[PDB]
Design an enzyme around this catalytic site. Structure first.
Site: not given
Ligand code: AR6
Ligand code: 7N2
Ligand code: ZN
Length: 282
Positions: A226, A132, A224, A161, A104, A44, A124, A242, A198
């Site tokens: 943090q 479908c 990063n 379909c 992610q 993120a 994710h 970044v 990140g």
């Protein structure tokens, strides 16, 4: 949702001072030049500079929730532009220096930046992508698909379909998609360099994949603001924005960060473009 462990939120940010930021960015270059196989892992924090807040930064969605505060978006998902970072990754893959991309994020920016879906794993899911339930065909929409947690969107499949269309957004309960996970896992195991951008690396198995590169002796770089869960497994840790790290790296590599045409979907990676010759590194 209520019980869900949201990890460590709101830890302090670290700023490498500028001489150390420069020396570490040169070394990242050095590692990109010596690697046969690079895999980038994103979270993120690569989308914060286009107005999308993260989860666990000082003003991320889970952090602010713990303090009783709301997160703030400076854009819609539809109007969001990809960052310099996004565009740098587009170009690194076009020149053959990125082998595979693991993310992610559900924000849909890697696809919309034009990055090839056959070198990308969306662990994710993707807010613009519905699937479908009968034939597994995916539709990449120009607006966010209204539902989360793999539910029916209310549209049906058009393939030569009538199957039920569902969002691809995982809920806390849901297991990762296997194509994506196996591809990301295969790429991470064979990589000789994994660069994380990140992400705080706290979600499993998404956050563990970079460590796979350590098997058979690969190198690991974390960029990063943090601390992350695996900071002690890293060979290089860069504490900076970044976009500033990606732009300096691109300059050392002698590459331009290319222009975004607006929202585009590329299924399949194109033939590799020319790239600068490599420096001699003793
Ligand atoms: N401009 C920046 N430059 C460098 N780092 C940054 C920047 N902005 C933010 N950061 C760092 O960016 C990091 C972002 O980490 P986190 O917020 O945990 O997000 P994730 O993608 O790892 O979340 C994993 C999953 O967990 C969720 O439940 C969802 O399922 C996600 O898909 C922070 O440490 C920031 O310091
Ligand atoms: O915070 S969310 O509203 C969210 C999503 C799922 C579950 C929760 C929960 F905490 F309530 F369980 C919150 N939130 C969200 C908001 C709108 C659309 C989609 C999402 N979303 C999906 C997964 C994670 C998020 C996430 C998010 C994604 C990207 C950037 N910023 C935030
Ligand atoms: Zn179908």
């Amino acid at each position: 949702p209520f019980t869900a462990d949201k990890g460590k939120c709101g830890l302090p940010e670290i700023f490498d001072p500028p001489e150390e930021l420069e020396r570490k960015v040169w070394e990242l270059a050095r590692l990109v030049w010596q690697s046969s196989s690079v895999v980038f892992h994103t979270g993120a924090g690569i989308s914060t500079a286009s107005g999308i807040p993260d989860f666990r930064g000082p003003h991320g969605v889970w952090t602010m929730e713990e303090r009783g505060l709301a997160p703030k978006f400076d854009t819609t998902f539809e109007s969001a532009r990809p960052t310099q970072t996004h565009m740098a990754l587009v170009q690194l893959e076009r020149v053959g220096l990125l082998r595979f991309l693991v993310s992610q994020n559900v924000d849909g920016l890697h696809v919309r930046s034009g990055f090839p879906r056959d070198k990308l794993a969306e662990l994710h899911g993707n807010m613009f992508v519905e699937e479908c339930a009968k034939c597994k065909t995916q539709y990449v929409r120009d607006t966010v698909v209204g539902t989360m947690g793999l539910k029916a969107t209310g549209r049906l499949c058009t393939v030569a379909c009538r199957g039920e269309l569902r969002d691809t957004i995982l809920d806390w309960e849901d297991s990762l998609p296997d194509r994506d996970l196996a591809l990301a896992d295969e790429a991470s195991r064979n990589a000789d360099l994994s660069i994380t951008l990140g992400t705080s690396l706290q979600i499993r198995p998404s956050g563990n994949l970079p460590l796979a590169t350590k098997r058979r002796g690969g190198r690991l770089v974390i960029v990063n603001l943090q601390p992350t869960k695996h900071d002690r497994h890293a060979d290089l840790r860069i504490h900076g924005y970044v976009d500033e790290v990606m732009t300096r790296l691109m300059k050392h590599l002698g590459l331009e960060i290319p222009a975004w045409d607006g929202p585009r979907v590329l299924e399949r990676a194109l033939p590799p473009l020319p790239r600068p010759p490599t420096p001699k590194l003793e």
